[PDB]
Design a protein around this ligand. Sequence first.
Ligand SMILES: [Fe+2]
Ligand SMILES: [Fe+2]
Ligand SMILES: [Fe+2]
Ligand SMILES: [Fe+2]
Lengths: 323, 329
Amino acid sequence: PQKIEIFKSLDNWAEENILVHLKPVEKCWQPQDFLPDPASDGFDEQVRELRERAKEIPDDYFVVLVGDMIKEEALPTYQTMLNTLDGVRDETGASPTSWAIWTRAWTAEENRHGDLLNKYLYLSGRVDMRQIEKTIQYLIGSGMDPRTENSPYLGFIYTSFQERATFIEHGNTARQAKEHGDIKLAQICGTIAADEKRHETAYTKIVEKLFEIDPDGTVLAFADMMRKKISMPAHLMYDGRDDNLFDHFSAVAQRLGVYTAKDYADILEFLVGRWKVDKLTGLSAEGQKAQDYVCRLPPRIRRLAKEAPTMPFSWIFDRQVKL
Amino acid sequence: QKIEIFKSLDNWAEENILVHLKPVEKCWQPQDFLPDPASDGFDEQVRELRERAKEIPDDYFVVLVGDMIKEEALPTYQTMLNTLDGVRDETGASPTSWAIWTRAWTAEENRHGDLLNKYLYLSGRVDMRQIEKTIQYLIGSGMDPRTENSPYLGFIYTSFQERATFIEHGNTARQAKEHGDIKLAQICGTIAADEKRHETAYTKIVEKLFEIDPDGTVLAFADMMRKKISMPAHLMYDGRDDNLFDHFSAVAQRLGVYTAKDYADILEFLVGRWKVDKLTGLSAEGQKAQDYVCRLPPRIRRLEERAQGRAKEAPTMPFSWIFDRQVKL
Ligand SMILES: [Fe+2]
Ligand SMILES: [Fe+2]
Ligand SMILES: [Fe+2]
Ligand SMILES: [Fe+2]
């Protein structure tokens, strides 16, 4: 109960330092901004142009984009996760605490990412939305356990890591969409990436305050979380066909450079820096041991070739792409 | 106490509740009811959809949109379920029956919003920007059903809510035939069919609760009706209309998609389905609760017959969901 009551005092602090990173709803983009306008005369031409540009984008890029989209559409899970955490749990479903307001507003923001990408993929005609839709249903039913243990310390370190990861992913899919000739798609991934950046900023800011107030508790938390490993939110991906769907998806994302094990370590190196775990002093014997583990981890991961096989993906009608 | 009751019923739930989920491989997917973007007939299928959509009036669309928005607010309803004391998913992937249900239920409901969303998108008859914005408000806004962490209140509530969506989606299916669109009718009907399974499961839980603890469960049922069943989309807002929910509910009332009659008919059904009617050996409080509940449905029907008698013009009203075009209230 002492790590829990910490969060009720920070309620007002959160209003001023965290909630400021949400975009007010009137100022928020909506999927429709980046999609063929079904109320205009140019609808049919906009859709024809989209599908025409989509033919020039290779299947492997689509496999990765799809995977990222699925990850997004599993949103209910991530709101639930947030409400497992002890100081921030929405008690009623419309609680007026800062932490609850964030949780709901963050959710409302992330909801547009899936919506936009879903329609884009639908219109493209380059993927099987039936199998994608089924994958999503498995994923939501499946849930996800990040092993944050109801601890806001673990939880917000986790979300911090996750937000930066999606920032990198969406960022790279934006880059490669330009490279394949589709700037409208590049815009979609870029705008989404920009949202994730605001979320990263807010979540890293919470952990910064936690490192200020309770540095011992927060390095130990940070050590615990890396010891367990950061479990990815879509690790339980399943399409009813491939038992190793996540690994096969991750492998295409690795090859294309959308998300690599390098990017994993780079994120951890960033978070060590951003929280100045590096220069933390006056810790318990445990706290110091945790500090070491954390700081030495990124080079140790980075330390740890060729023609890969082709693999069919039900998301693209079992057509094959390299791994 | 009321919490430990649910950890015993874990195994019972596996056999009597989880059986009402459709296995994922046997589930329809929005793509089944939509133009296939991978076929050559895509452009024709879309042209046909939009052509049929022109013959559907604006007022039906206002109601369909409102129901679609209600659906797309799904994250909220999963959260609600996880506020309840005996059923809360502790980890986010808890293997308890109640948690498996919560997630699977959510996964099922998700296809309802997806499907309707793309339909409305393709129709070209609505402003998806304002709809999208309304949804963002709605999710940020949350919803408090005043179930108080009680699974007794909670599942009574969901039971009521599931039957309501069954009726709504059901009626929008009927009226889509009447306006010439069977493919839309099919969409609403397939969704309605899912809600029916959910209703059945939720009513089944409360039935067991009325068996084990009849005193606790009538009191819960009275509590919930005394408060009134607060609708999940009551906080609807598009950044323009401060009375958006009432104005939406009014069009749905006029069109007969959901009326105060249907409210009472639901309550009369649930009184019957749970046999609150023939419950015996209750506390003095339990008996008072039993009375209130059973006398309520005719009351409501009386008060509505009177309300219809003194109706205050009902103007036309603009809706941002249809580019501020106007429809009667
Ligand atoms: Fe996202
Ligand atoms: Fe994000
Ligand atoms: Fe539904
Ligand atoms: Fe339902």
